Amino acid sequence: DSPGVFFDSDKGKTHSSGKVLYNARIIPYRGSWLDFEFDPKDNLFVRIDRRRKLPATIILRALNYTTEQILDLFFEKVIFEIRDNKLQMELVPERLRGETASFDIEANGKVYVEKGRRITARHIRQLEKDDVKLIEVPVEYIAGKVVAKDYIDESTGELICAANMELSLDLLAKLSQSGHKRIETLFTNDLDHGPYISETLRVDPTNDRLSALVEIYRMMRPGEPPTREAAESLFENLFFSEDRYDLSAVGRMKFNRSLLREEIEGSGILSKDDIIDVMKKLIDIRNGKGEVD
Amino acid sequence: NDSGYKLGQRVRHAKFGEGTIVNMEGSGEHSRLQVAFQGQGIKWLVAAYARLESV
C-alpha cells in the first residue's frame, strides 16, 4: 500500500443481489486511515482507523456542519412559491431532461408539454429561449419532496419543520399558514442524482457537533467516559495534527491528482474540503459519473 | 449548550404557557430547546427566535 486516495468496488461480489458496492480510502504516509463506503441500501458510511463503520455524515457534523449545511454541500435546490393561492415552481428547464410530464407544463398562456408526453431537448430549448422560470404545479406534486432547510414559526419560535423532513400536504398547509410562501426542497431522482446523503442523515443517530464528537470518541476509546476536551482533542489528532498525521508530499500529489486539482503542492494534514471532495467523488461514481481507479 | 438555558429549567412562553426543558441540541444561533408544555405537549423551539421567560 502507498500513500494517496483510492476509489474501488467489490465488483458486485458480496451480496446475492450482485449490487456493486463502491468505496474510497485515504492512506497517509503515517497516521490513521479514513475510509468511505456504500451499503446495499445506498447509505454512506465512514470508517476511522479501520474500525466499525459509522453513518458518514457524523464526520461532517464533527467538522461543524449543520444538517442544512450538509444538504447544501450535496444537493441542488428546487424552490416552490405560494402565490395567488397556487403552488408555483421555479424552473430550471435542463432539470426536466429524461422525465415524462405528470402535468401540463405551461406558461404565459402557452402549453409547452402535455401531461402524457416525454420531455424533449427541443422542449427544453424552447423553455430556455422563452425564459420560462416559473410554472404552476398541482399541490400533490409537493408530496415526497424533501425540505432542504429548517422552517420556524417566527411568531412563536417553534420549529415547524426540520431540514431533511419529507414534505406532505399537511406540512405544506402548516408552512403556508405560518406565512412561509417560499419553500426549498432537494433536487434528486432515483437514477443519476441519488438521495444518498439525505437517507444517510436518517440513520445518523447524532444531531450536532458535540454528539458526533462523542460518538467518534466512544468508538475509538471503549471504557473511557468521555469529556469535552478529550473528544475534541482526539478528533483534532486523527487527521488535523502534524504530530500525528502526514499524507506526505507524494501522498498529497497523488491525492490532488485523483481529485483533478491543478496544484501538486499541499498540506501533510487533511482539510474539510479534502474530506468533502473525496465524498463527492465517491457519490459521482455511484451516480454513474466517472469510474473507479 | 452555551445558549443561556439549562436542562430541567422551567420556562414561560406567551402562547404555549409554562413548561420544562427536556432536551437541547446545537450551539450558537442554531441552539434549539425541546420543551414539555403542561397542557400543550412537547415542542422544539429555536432559542434565538423564541421569547422565553425564566420562571
Ordered strands of the A182-186 beta sheet? A134-137, A86-90, A77-83, A182-186
Q: Which residues from chain B sit within 8 angstroms of residue A207, using beta carbons?
A: 25-26
The span from the CA of B27 to the CA of A73, in Å, is 20
Concatenate the DSSP letters of all residues of A105-173 into one string. EEETTEEEE-TTSBPPHHHHHHHHHTT--EEEE-GGGGTT-BB-S-EEETTTTEEEE-TTPBP-HHHHH
| Inter-CA distances, A258 with A7, A65, A89, Å | 9, 25, 38
* Chosen domain end from A190, A224, A252: A190
Contact A100/B at CB under 8 A:
no
Q: Say if residue A134 is in the same domain as residue A220.
A: no
Surface of A (173-232) touching B: CB under 8 A: 207-211
**CATH code for the domain of A29:** 3.90.1110.10
The span from the CA of A145 to the CA of A165, in Å, is 9
Contact B4/A at CB under 8 A:
no
From the centroid of its chain, how far is CA A109? 37
**Residue B44 is nearest to which of A159, A208, A211, comparing CB atoms?**
A159
Q: Which residues contact A121 (CB under 8 A, 6 or more apart)?
A: A97
The span from the CA of A2 to the CA of A117, in Å, is 53
A interface mutation test: which of B5, B11, B12, B15 has the most A CBs within 10 A? B15
Q: Which residues contact A219 (CB under 8 A, 6 or more apart)?
A: A48, A51, A52, A54
Inter-chain CB proximity B45 and A157 less than 8 Å: yes
Contact B45/A at CB under 8 A:
yes
Contact A150/B at CB under 8 A:
yes
Pairs of residues, one from chain A and one from chain B, whose beta carbons lie less than 8 Å apart: 39
Residue A293 lies in a domain: no
Residue B23 lies in a domain: yes
User: CB under 8 Å, gap of 24 or more: what pairs does A49-56 form?
Assistant: A49/A220, A49/A238, A51/A219, A51/A220, A52/A219, A54/A215, A54/A216, A54/A219, A55/A200, A55/A201, A55/A203, A55/A204, A55/A205, A56/A197, A56/A200, A56/A279
Residue B4 lies in a domain: no
Burial label for A206, CB within 10 Å (0-12, 13-18, 19+), is buried
Q: Which residues contact A76 (CB under 8 A, 6 or more apart)?
A: A186, A187
CB A104 within 8 A of CB A171: no
**Domain membership of residue A202 as a residue range:** 4-71+197-286
CB A31 within 8 A of CB A245: yes
Element holding A277 (H helix, E strand)? helix A272-286
Q: Say if residue A166 is in the same domain as residue A138.
A: yes
CB A219 within 8 A of CB A48: yes
| Model resolution, angstroms | 1.7
Residue A292 lies in a domain: no
The span from the CA of A20 to the CA of A120, in Å, is 31
Residue A132 lies in a domain: yes
Cell of A40: 446495499
The span from the CA of B53 to the CA of B50, in Å, is 10
The span from the CA of A155 to the CA of A171, in Å, is 17
CB atoms within 10 A of CB A55: 22
Residue B1 lies in a domain: no
CB A142 within 8 A of CB A172: yes
* Chosen domain end from A190, A225, A251: A190
The domain total for chain A is: 2
The amino acid present at A147, given as its one-letter code, is V
CB A185 within 8 A of CB A78: yes
**Domain membership of residue B32 as a residue range:** 10-54
Query: Could you tell me which of A273, A269, A289 has the C-alpha nearest to residue A281?
Result: A289
Q: At what angle do helices A272-286 and A67-74 cross, to 10 degrees?
A: 60
The domain total for chain B is: 1
Inter-chain CB proximity B50 and A158 less than 8 Å: yes
Element holding A184 (H helix, E strand)? strand A182-186
Contact A158/B at CB under 8 A:
yes
Name residue, grid cell 458518514. A56
